[PDB]
Amino acid sequence: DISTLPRVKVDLVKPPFVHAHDQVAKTGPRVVEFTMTIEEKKLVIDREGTEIHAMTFNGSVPGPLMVVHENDYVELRLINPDTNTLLHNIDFHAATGALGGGALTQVNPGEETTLRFKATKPGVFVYHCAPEGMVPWHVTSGMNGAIMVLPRDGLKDEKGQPLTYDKIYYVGEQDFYVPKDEAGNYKKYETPGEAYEDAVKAMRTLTPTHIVFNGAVGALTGDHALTAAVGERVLVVHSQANRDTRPHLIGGHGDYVWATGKFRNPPDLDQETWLIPGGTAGAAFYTFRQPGVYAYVNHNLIEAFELGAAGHFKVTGEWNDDLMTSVVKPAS
C-alpha cells in the first residue's frame, strides 16, 4: 500500500556533484520525490565559441544524477515551461514498461506530468528524452542523465565484502554533431527548430564534431577539476546515452569496475580502461595512492585531446617513492 510509505523530497544538484544520500539504507522503502524542469538554452561548447541549442533536464548537460535504493519508488514531476518550444518526455532505463516511461510523459510547452516507477534492479542507468520521431536529436542535444539505484546494503566487492566510497562524482559524456557549411565552419541558428534537417544530416555521418564531459571542452578543469586526497575512495559514475566510450584514469586504475553498471554482478578488478557501451552508465571505484594532477579521459585519444573528452582530478597528500620515483631526472 503506497499511501502508507514515507515520502522524501530530494533537491538535485548540478553535475559533477551528486545529491546527499546514504549508501546503506537507514529506512525501509520510500517514495522518493524529484522535480525536474526542462530548459532549452544556448550553450557554448568549445574555446572557439561554437554555440548550440541545447535541450536540458534542469539546465545542465548532463542532467543531474538521481540516487535511490533498490525497491524504492521514484516519483518524478517533470515540468516543460511555456518558454520552451519543443515537446519532450523521459525514458528511464531503470524502469519497466511504457518505453521506460516515455509513452506516459509527453509534455508540450506549458505542461507538466508526474510519473512513478518502482526501482526493481540495482545499478546505474541512463535516462534520456525520447520523443517519437526525434529521439537521437534530443539525446545528442544534451537531453540525458543517469539514475543510481543502490542495493539496500550498499556496494560489495567480488568477495561480497562492503565497499564504501568517500566521494562520488558523475561524469556525463556527450557526443555533439554540430552542422557544418561547405568549407567546414559550424552553422548557427536562432531557434532549435531551425537546425532540424541540418542536424539530421550531421548525425548521419556518425562522426561527432565534439565529445565533451559536463557539457563543454575543458568543463572539468582548472577551478572545476575534480578533487580528492590520498587515501580517499572515490566512485566515478560515467554515462554515455548514445555512443561507446572507454574511460581511463591517467596515472591510476579502476580498482573495481562495473563497466555496464549493474551491481548484482561482481566488479572487474584492476582495470586500465573499460568500455561503457552507448546507452549505458558504468561506475568505477578507485582509492588514490599518489598526489598530483590526474587526467580522466575517453581513451580514444583523438576523442579525448582533440574532440574534448578529458577532465582533471587534483589530488592532495603525500608522495610515495616506493610506487614511483624518478631515478635520474631528464638530462643530456
Add this chain to the structure above:
Amino acid sequence: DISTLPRVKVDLVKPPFVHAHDQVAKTGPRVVEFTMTIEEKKLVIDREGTEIHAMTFNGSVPGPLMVVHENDYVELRLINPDTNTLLHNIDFHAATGALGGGALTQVNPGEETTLRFKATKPGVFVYHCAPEGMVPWHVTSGMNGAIMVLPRDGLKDEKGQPLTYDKIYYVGEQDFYVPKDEAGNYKKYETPGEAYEDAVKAMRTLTPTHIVFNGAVGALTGDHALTAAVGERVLVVHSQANRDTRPHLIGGHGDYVWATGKFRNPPDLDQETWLIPGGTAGAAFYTFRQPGVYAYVNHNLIEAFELGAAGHFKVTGEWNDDLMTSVVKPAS
C-alpha cells in the same frame, strides 16, 4: 564411430523465427543434417526503394539460425545453383580447423559440397561467407547468419539453476554500405559484379548507409513485430558479423545476458544495454512484466532511428501499476 550415430534432418525456417528444437537433449549425440541454398537476389532495404544485390544463405538476411547440442555433429549440404554468378563458401565460428570450414566449401555456381564438423563448444556463434579476396563484400551484402550450440542440459543461470525459455527469436543485424554518386544518391547496378570497386570504396569509409534488422528498415514492425505475453520468458539471439552493436529493449532489460554469447560463462545480470562485438553472436533472456509496445534497438540512437536498427515487440496481458504508473497525466 560416426556411422552408428542417429541422423536427423532439420528443415530450417526464416528469421526471426527458429526451427523446432529441444533445450534439454532428449537423445544422445546425433549427426544433425541441414541443407542451405545460396541465393543472390535484389533486395529493397529502405522506405525510399533503395535496392542492393544481396548475397544470401537460404534467401534471407540474415541466414537462418541452426540449433544443435554440444557434441552433436553438424552436417551441412551447401548448394550454389547455376543461376548465381559468384563463388561462395561458409565459415562457421563454431567449428575448429580449415578457416571454420571456409577452406573446404568453395562452391562455384552449379556446385555443391557437404561439410561435417563437431560442435565442441556451447554458445551462439556467427557463420558467414568468406571467399579469398572478397570477404567483407560478401558479409556486408548479407551473407551471414548464426548457429546455437546448446549445452546438453540446457541453459543455466549464474548460480547453475536451469533457465528455460518459452519463445526464442533471432535478430540478425546488418551493416550495408550502398555506394553513392557525387551528390549523395545511391547507385544501382544490373549485376553483383558491376558494383565491386564502388562497393570497396563505400566500405573503406567505415560508415554504413543502412543498419537493419532482418534485412530491411522496418522489417520487425507492424504485422511483423515480435510477440510475447506478460510472464513469458524470451531468449533473443542477436548477431553482427562485421560491426559492434549495443542492443537495448526499450521498457525492459536483459535479465540474463551472454553478451559475447558463450554459455560456459555465467550471464551478466540486469543489463540495460550490452555490447556485442562485430564478428560475434550474443543472447539475452528476459521475462516480460508489462504489456504494450517495446522497441528493441541498437542504442547508438542514430544507428537505430536514422539508419534502421530498430524493431518492435508487441506484448499482451495485464498492466501492473506497482511497477509503473502515471500519477498526474500530462496537463497544463
Add this chain to the structure above:
Amino acid sequence: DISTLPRVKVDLVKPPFVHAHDQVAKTGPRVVEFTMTIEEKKLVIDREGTEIHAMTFNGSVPGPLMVVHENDYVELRLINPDTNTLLHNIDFHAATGALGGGALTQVNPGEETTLRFKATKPGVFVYHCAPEGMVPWHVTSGMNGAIMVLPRDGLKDEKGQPLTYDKIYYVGEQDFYVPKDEAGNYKKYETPGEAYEDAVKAMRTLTPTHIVFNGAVGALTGDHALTAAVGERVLVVHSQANRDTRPHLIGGHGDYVWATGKFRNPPDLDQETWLIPGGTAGAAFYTFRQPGVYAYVNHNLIEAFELGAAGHFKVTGEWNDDLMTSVVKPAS
C-alpha cells in the same frame, strides 16, 4: 629497502616475439632493468609504398613487450638521441602516479632519463608516449607498446588451476591516419614536424586510413607468419592504444580470454571474438587442435581485409577428421 633487492638486466626483442621470462617466479621480487631508445624513422606501411614518419620505441611498431612479475620494480632507462627531432616521454598504464610516469620522463633530443615504478597489479597493460599537447599524434604515429605483469605463481583458469603457455606472441595493432590531398592521394613530408596540422585534420575524421599488425599491411604473413604445432598452448597478447578492436582466430577460438587483460579476474571461456577497448591490452590462450593456415584478424572485416588488420598462423601436425571433415568435396 630497494638497494638490497637483486637487479636483473633484460635485453628486449622485436615484436611479435617476446623476451625470455619465467611464468612462475623462480626468485623473490627484483628490480628489472630495461633500456629503450626512441627512434623517429620513415616506415613503409602498405603494398602501394605509402610512407609515414613513425615515432617508435626501440625501432619497432609496436614497441617491445616487457615482462615482469607482480611486485617487481621496473626500472627503465629511456634514451632520446639527438638525431630525433621531437620531445617524447612514456606513460605506463601499469604504473601509479605522475600520469603513469609521463610527468617525469619528458626527454628532449639528446637527453635520457631513468624511471622506476612498482608493478602492483597483474595483467597486460599499454604503455605509450604522451607529450603535453601532442598526445594522439605520437600514439597514432606508432609510439606505443605493452607490458605484462605476471602473477608470481603464473596464470590460472576460472577454477584457479594453473594455465601454462608453450609459446607467447605479441600483436600490436596500429591505427594510422595518413593525410590525403583533394583527390584522396596520401601526402608525403620530409620531416615529422611538417605533417603536424595535416595530421590533426586527418585524426579528427576518426577514420583510419590503415589498421595494421606489427607496423605494416602483411607484416605477420609469409615468412613472418606466427607458428605453432598441434597440441601447443599459445598466449597471444594484443594491444590497441587508441581504438577498439575485436580479435578473432579464423578456424579457432579464444579458449581462455582476458579481453581487458587483468589477471585477477577469471577468464572468459570459449570466445569466438572479444572486444579489446582502445587504450587496453588483452590476452587470449588457445590450444591448437588442427594443422594448417589460420588467419588472426580484427573482425570488423573491412578493417581486416581492406585496411590491413590481418595476420597468419601456420600450424604443423596431424589432421583430426572427427573435428572436421569434407564429406563431399565441391563438385557439379
